[PDB]
């Protein structure tokens, strides 16, 4: 009932949903606990977001990060918006990535990713 | 007058400030058009930030952003903050990296840098 640009994700792997933006477990993490946040609507550049989209999308990109930084035992984190082809993006909707980090740090199952969700999910309570 | 964690900064070479949030070029840009966001307050983690805060943090992230894709024909844009050590942060200040991107795209004099900022500030006017 989400969708996050072509694809259309499942309630059960989105862990926050907002007035205008929602989380979602990655289904291909680079680190532990690599989720994204992204607004509701499905616009393709950041710069096509009204500016309240703006405020709510990195308002709530703020908690998750700070969740998942708690749940990882990461250090600290890294946040990273790949704004457009030649940025590096491939699904065409305005998405950040957000990443807990630990020091010297340098596909998954549709019932693990929901279990990394409720699990998340449990902290916006 | 303005102050990037330790460095206090200059006026001239700030291009834009709003009401909590400030922008300024790059004294080492990674590729042209390099610039930095950051809030007035020199919190040293994102989540120190208030909620205001944030929202006008990432709404003049959105302007700066495409303001330098325009002066710098990047084809897009890449947005990046590394929030605390470990992430990648050196100066402890939050502030957002923005960069504008080409096609297989892959310190400064405080004169010419002060051009590039003058030169910037006109697209705000």
């Known amino acids: ?12 792997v989105v862990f926050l949903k907002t007035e205008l933006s929602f989380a979602l477990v990655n289904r291909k993490p680079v680190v532990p606990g690599h989720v994204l ?11 096509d977001l009204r500016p309240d989209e703006v ?4 308002q709530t990109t703020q908690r998750v990060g700070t969740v998942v930084e708690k749940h990882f035992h990461g250090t600290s984190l890294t946040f990273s918006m790949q704004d457009g ?9 305005v998405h950040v990535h957000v990443l807990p980090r630990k020091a010297g740090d340098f596909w998954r199952s549709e019932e693990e990713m929901a279990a990394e969700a409720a699990a998340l999910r449990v902290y916006f309570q």
């Open 55 to 58: 405020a709510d999308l990195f």
């Open 1 to 12: 009932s989400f969708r996050f640009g072509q694809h259309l994700i499942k309630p059960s």
């Open 85 to 93: 082809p030649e940025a590096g993006q491939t699904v065409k909707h």
């Open 37 to 47: 946040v992204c607004p509701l609507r499905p616009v393709e550049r950041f710069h």
